[PDB]
């Protein structure tokens, strides 16, 4: 398969590009102050999977606020590590989700966020 640092989302493996782009473009035209986000565990992560992986988040929510919400859903221990990756790098927690989206969304108009217990995506 691919190299360990190539970001793979089961969402993309389960839904053809056409379906994703139709959905992402429609949701952005409808809700211009919200951004659509797919959240999944990185393949090698020793972290629980998320119940819900598809989010519509306010554009003025910060990355650190979204992280709080996602971490709350995973039900981690107080000592546990968790890192987000967008396009292979840890996104700045002080950025807004709207800015992160504007810079990083794919051609299907989704923003893709992976999480791991390791600070490097493929480790």
């Amino acid at each position: 398969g691919p190299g360990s640092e190539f970001m793979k989302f089961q969402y993309k493996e389960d839904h053809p590009f056409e379906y994703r782009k139709k959905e992402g473009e429609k949701i952005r035209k409808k809700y211009p102050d919200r951004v659509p986000v797919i959240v999944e565990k990185a393949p090698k992560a020793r972290v629980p999977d998320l119940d819900k992986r598809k989010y519509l988040v306010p554009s003025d929510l910060t990355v650190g606020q979204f992280y709080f919400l996602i971490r709350k859903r995973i039900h981690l221990r107080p000592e546990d590590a968790l890192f987000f990756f967008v396009n292979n790098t840890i996104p700045p927690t002080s950025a807004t989700m709207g800015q992160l989206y504007e810079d990083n969304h794919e051609e299907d108009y989704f923003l893709y966020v992976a999480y791991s217990d390791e600070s490097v995506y493929g480790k």
Partner: peptide, 23 residues
Amino acid sequence: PEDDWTEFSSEEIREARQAAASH
């Protein structure tokens, strides 16, 4: 339940803004 959207509630957003406020 194929592929629903999840949106946070307003109170959930409020709690997040309080626990991860800007510096």
